[PDB]
RNA sequence: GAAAUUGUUGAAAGGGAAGGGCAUUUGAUCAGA
RNA sequence: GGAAUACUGCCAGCUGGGACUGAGGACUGCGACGUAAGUCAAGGAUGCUGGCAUAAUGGUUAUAUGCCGCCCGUCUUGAAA
RNA sequence: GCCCUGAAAAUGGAUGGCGCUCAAGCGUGUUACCUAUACUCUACCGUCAGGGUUAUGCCCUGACGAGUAGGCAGGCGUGGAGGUCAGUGACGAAGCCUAGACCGUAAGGUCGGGUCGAACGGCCUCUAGUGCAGAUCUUGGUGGUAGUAGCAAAUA
RNA sequence: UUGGCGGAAAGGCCUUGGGUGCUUGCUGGCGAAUUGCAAUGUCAUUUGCGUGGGGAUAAAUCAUUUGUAUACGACUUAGA
């Protein structure tokens, strides 16, 4: 119901998010994923590291430069999981993937914007408690991603700025709600209450 | 990775480095860092910024 | 800004990017 | 002008081309049945050219009719034209290719006098 | 001879049509359409403009006035299937719709007959519109679908 | 598109191509190389189309072409036009 | 005032298709806010328009239109089948479409 | 004075083939009434 | 002790929306509604209205897009090989 | 009952892939839904049968349509011959080119434009040295390979 | 127009003042018509030529040369 949808990857499952996103792009919705480093996978760390190693040992033998390119970042892991769903070898699939943008962390201009979630892809809702899960920043740093220490240092600044913003907005909202409560009990407000507002 | 966001040069430079910037030195007017030296004016607001 | 030519050059780059749709962050 | 007729529908407007007539110059577009037993076109595999068959045939009431609603009749002279004195709402004259311009004007004049439609006027008559 | 001749020739006698058993029968309009009902137009010059309903005509159409005074819509013929019928209503008493028929609108600037008829009807229409609060402004306004509006759920 | 996944490639290429082609079409229209509408006075719809007669009447009204006229055909056209105007005069009288 | 919309926004998803076969004569439309066939039964029979832009101006407009009708539902999620006078070109999978409120039964 | 084949001009397509079938968009071109 | 409802089934019960089709070409027939007169949804669609009247619809052609599509013939149980 | 093990090598690799963990897995049950040249209804083409009617034709009705070796039937086309159109034609015959038009399910036929400059067609029949993608086919011609290999023995 | 913040791809955020219009917060007065019963019915940068804003005055490549280089291209140097 929007021109563009920003999705916070925190607390989500890679494959389910990939499925819903792919079917949205193929329908024509523009989507932007952020905080891929906080993304989650089902199963313990060991299993998924073993899986990535199984993927990593695969390579064209007579020339390694033309084989499966093993991208280490969480954004690229998610992009792989997604591209395997889309028929990316078609113009339709290319145009679909060109409606997508994946980012580690929340950079500008999306930091000053609203983010959403997908409840049929969240870990806490889809998984049963008492089940091991894996996080993608840890996995990528294990398999050779050399940037997890900068993204944390930057998110620690973004969060402070956002907290200042929220502390301002929350006092403004208190003022507004108090003024509205004082305006209430007027006959205009009674009519609005009757009509459902 | 690492990104360069600014580079600052000196006021006066030598014909040697100017030659490095140039590829046909004997024909040019040698206009390399004229406007930068001009940007090195009274207080150097840009330089200090 | 840096106030001399970076302003014009950067706004022109961004508008070329937004007309050709060749921008990494913006659509 | 012509008679009322049912609406014309054809069932196949596209031409029936021979297999590999696009691939070879020696193989012409005239239709020829593939007699091969290993032939996917004869075996009617999915994703192949269509073959002519009587199911594609046109309706008898609209057969041999041009969009004007007339059946074409070739004409070389005023005598062949006067065969169609009655049948103006069913038939339409078409002057033969071998006819000359001094006789074409005669044929057109008589066709105008008799109230006959000519299919190919302006032939050798641009002057 | 170039093309010899056919021995057979079809006769050029064109035959009459069979007696068709398809008689015109009057229209059965939906329940929501009743005179004095406020209507929303979905197409035309005046798409999205709220008007009133006055009369059903011989050619299946509906006669409507804006009124012209408030929203700028004249006496007009409108199809019933390009219209939404609100539950809002006005009482029609005294307006002379008897004059207007299908021949009134045949066309073959504006006619003094037309402006005369329009004024004399919309004085009597405004007189009853003034009873309800805000109906003048409601009819002056235009209709539009906002974000989050679903016509299958919307009561009109 | 793997080295830059967040940059559109094909949509930009197709934007470029469609604008490419639209400009060329508009200029081929401005240069009068495309044929006019069916009802325009200079149109040739229903008539016969022959570059020989076109060149004949152009050189009677009297920057590189493959269109010539064959003086043979020019003499033939003059002959047949004399016949045509003879018939028109016999209608005359 | 700010909005003059008298249509509903929808998306052209696909043609009617099997696994490996498609019927271009029938198209599939997803309507905004419609989640069930019980709701799409409202929108059946409605008129559909795909509006696109060309460079040429043909009859006083650079804007061209393809008209069609909604015919029936498709599945359980509120998707509908549609038929146009001329079938859509398949470069429009993921393109917006206008579903008008006429012909109205209200 | 055909075809294979070739040159110039004009239009178009082209991310490790091309060609073909169904359907339509876009551009060009065209007949009938 | 008194009812109701569910389930199953029936109605030659009522009503509404949506899609595709309109074959045939004077009459003849079974029927129905009607005091008759005649009328009718009864042996295949009629009626009202607007716009354009031309490249607009449509065809042909060069491309693009979605899906499909292995190079022909012969030989043999059977091959893209 | 489910789970682990219950042995299997060597280019990198496949529940079809992505990926899935109160499943997008196993078992079972209840509904809704997708979808074939299959089933139903309608139109059209053809065949077959049955009827009707002063015309190997016209009309009504209905059921059917896979196909190799192979069989039967109806048709299209080429060279020459008898007849006929008192046919066509230097105001342009045949032939050739053609993003142009039309008719037939098709074989094929017809038209327009351009080139060409002297003979050629429809119909009732006859006749045959009568229709090609192949045959490591015949003759002739032409290409990519390719401005490439190379034009380096014998002293200059 | 004041002042401040913001470097992850900041290119945006907030703020001061004075102008300039509008205000459907409330009540009035005029106009709409024939787009003819619907036809999406079109509403959201400049490159190019009037525009006269209208002044300021760089390089690379070939050729030549060098050999820290080299099959040829390339590379590396020099030359008013």
GROMACS .gro file of C-alpha atoms in nm, chain C residues 1-24:
model
   24
  247UNK     CA    1   2.892   2.223   0.156
  248UNK     CA    2   3.242   2.303   0.030
  249UNK     CA    3   3.070   2.600  -0.140
  250UNK     CA    4   3.277   2.652  -0.459
  251UNK     CA    5   3.199   2.382  -0.716
  252UNK     CA    6   3.130   2.065  -0.514
  253UNK     CA    7   2.773   2.191  -0.463
  254UNK     CA    8   2.689   2.216  -0.834
  255UNK     CA    9   2.889   1.907  -0.933
  256UNK     CA   10   2.729   1.689  -0.666
  257UNK     CA   11   2.372   1.803  -0.730
  258UNK     CA   12   2.429   1.744  -1.102
  259UNK     CA   13   2.568   1.396  -1.031
  260UNK     CA   14   2.268   1.313  -0.811
  261UNK     CA   15   2.020   1.435  -1.073
  262UNK     CA   16   2.194   1.241  -1.350
  263UNK     CA   17   2.174   0.939  -1.118
  264UNK     CA   18   1.803   0.997  -1.051
  265UNK     CA   19   1.713   1.045  -1.419
  266UNK     CA   20   1.916   0.747  -1.543
  267UNK     CA   21   1.797   0.554  -1.232
  268UNK     CA   22   2.162   0.451  -1.174
  269UNK     CA   23   2.177   0.516  -0.801
  270UNK     CA   24   2.281   0.269  -0.538
   0.00000   0.00000   0.00000
